[PDB]
Write a protein that binds this ligand. Structure first.
Ligand SMILES: OC[C@H]1O[C@@H](O[C@H]2[C@H](O)[C@@H](O)[C@H](O[C@@H]3[C@@H](O)[C@H](O)O[C@H](CO)[C@H]3O)O[C@@H]2CO)[C@H](O)[C@@H](O)[C@@H]1O
Length: 255
């Protein structure tokens, strides 16, 4: 078996420093070397390239075979690479650094609503059963739920509330927390968010990790992005607890 002393490699950042060339420099000749690039990718070859969209420290492992022996180094990637990051994620986060908090558009009509959902034969693309007037859900927990997006190591999201989410009878029946009836009707349900979440954006699909939802519980973590720009995030979702019911939500930046 190779001796940890016999083995070496270089990790050289390119003109794009998020793309790193890994080269076997070991004191023994014609070993077979495999790599763990620290980013979920493994490779085999004397010289391979690794790409890291996100600023972080990463552990690279080279394994030489004659037996097998493994050595590691850490690399620091200094800055997020916009060329390898989902563009809509950067709008959600307000940029490649920092964070951006989004809140219900409570001051304008139509920031929450319900209608035939996209699989329903009556779908018309709008919350045609009920559309919330400005401040219509002031008297419940709905507007206390705020969502922060940030690209600190990955597609990260922070969910803050004051310990409650808003839902209806169908939703309350799927959640363990105590339910209360607030001034706006339906149900507040005790629900404490996890300290950290992730998200994915694939085309117009926004998915939240760990069964998260945008303050209003309808049994799904999948949203359809209808509008996303620096001033507005307009979402549809399809209820998993009331077949064929669709919900609409409009978020704007926290001021
Ligand atoms: O048109 C029949 C259609 O109605 C669905 O139920 C709707 C109902 O029409 C809406 O009036 C109702 O709106 C609720 C608001 O009045 C309330 O103030 O706020 C809550 C949100 O907190 C609104 O839900 O919504 C229900 C859907 O939840 C039926 O479900 C559907 O089967 C039927 O075809």
């Amino acid at each position: 078996k190779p001796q940890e002393s016999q083995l070496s490699f270089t990790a050289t950042p390119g003109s794009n420093p998020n793309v790193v060339t890994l080269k076997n420099t070991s004191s023994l000749k014609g070993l077979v070397v495999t790599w763990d690039l620290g980013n979920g990718v493994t490779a085999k070859g004397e010289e391979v390239v690794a790409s890291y969209p996100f600023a972080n420290t990463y552990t690279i492992a080279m394994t030489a075979y004659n037996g097998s022996t493994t050595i590691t180094q850490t690399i620091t990637i200094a800055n997020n690479d916009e060329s390898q990051i989902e563009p809509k994620a950067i709008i959600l986060a307000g940029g490649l650094t920092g964070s951006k908090t989004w809140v219900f558009d409570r001051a304008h009509d139509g920031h929450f609503g319900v209608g035939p959902g996209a699989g329903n034969p009556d779908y018309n693309g709008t919350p045609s059963w009920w559309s919330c007037p400005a401040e219509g859900k002031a008297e419940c927990a709905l507007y206390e739920n705020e969502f922060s997006f940030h690209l600190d190591g990955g597609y990260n999201m922070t969910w803050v509330n004051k310990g409650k989410i808003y839902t209806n009878g169908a939703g309350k029946d799927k959640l363990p927390g105590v339910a209360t009836v607030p001034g706006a009707g339906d149900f507040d349900v005790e629900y404490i968010p996890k300290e950290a979440y992730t998200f994915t954006v694939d085309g117009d699909k926004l998915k939240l990790s760990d069964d998260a939802f945008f303050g209003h519980f309808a049994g799904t973590s999948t949203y359809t992005i209808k509008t996303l720009n620096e001033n507005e995030l307009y979402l549809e979702c399809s209820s998993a607890v009331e077949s064929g019911n669709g919900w609409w939500y409009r978020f704007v930046p926290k001021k």
